[PDB]
Symmetry: C2
């Protein structure tokens, strides 16, 4: 194989952490604490029940990632997949990889009757999101989110 999308492996840890740092910085202004983030990526790599990373590789080099978590629906007897992140290495942009990754996940959902939907949440201030997702046949839902701020 020359180009493929595959499930992440444990030794993708530091590349996935790097990509997530770059993503949070580029998109949300954030400089993530690398100890916290690396722990968080490692915990997800070690527990398939928490979600999954897939990576896009070119002659074995990891150049992009997409991450999703699960929400079990009792009412529907299956999981929604919740897409939480996507990042493409700057050297490999404008080549369709973002869409390859989303379409790969769409196919996973379509081909698994144990997956009942595919969702994500994004900041309302993100100007470009509606058009990006529209292009992928993803449309805005009729829900509001609420949160309680936990403090320890």
């Amino acid at each position: 194989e020359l180009i493929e999308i595959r499930e992440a492996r444990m030794d993708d840890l530091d590349t996935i952490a790097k990509f997530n740092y770059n993503l949070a910085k580029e998109t949300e202004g954030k400089e993530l604490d690398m100890d916290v983030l690396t722990k968080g990526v490692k915990a997800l790599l070690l527990d398939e029940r928490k979600g999954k990373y897939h990576v896009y590789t070119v002659f074995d080099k990891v150049v992009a990632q997409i991450m999703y978590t699960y929400e079990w629906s009792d009412w529907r007897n299956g999981n929604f997949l919740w897409i939480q992140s996507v990042y493409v290495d700057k050297e490999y942009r404008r080549k369709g990889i973002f869409n390859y990754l989303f379409n790969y996940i769409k196919n996973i959902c379509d081909k698994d009757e144990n997956i009942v939907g595919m969702r994500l949440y994004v900041e309302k201030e993100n100007i470009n999101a509606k058009a990006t997702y529209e292009s992928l046949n993803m449309y805005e839902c009729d829900y509001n989110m609420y949160e309680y701020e936990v403090i320890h």
Copy 2:
């Protein structure tokens, strides 16, 4: 014990399924498929990694339930807890049970340093959600949800 909140057990399957059928009818105008719902509740009861039901019992009679799932955050190295349902048997309403359950889950979140937040999503049409959640210190988030229609 006379009144308590406890984790659900497999014996609670039929009652939790009935409560969820009643909930979906009363709050979303839905008539759930009982074959599918029964399977979905059983699957959740059998796998603590999918989420948890807690039930409110009175002299051993289950009279209410609350259900949550998890969302792992790699950036934060912790879980958000997502409340997916709350239901109180009609013969036990107006006695504070909804809030006992909700506050029980808030306490779980505040006491566990690895829970980073507590969230839910609700239909925009639910005219009473905002006041109900605001009274519990839960406030509307600045996100939109998107979804792909999984073609099954």
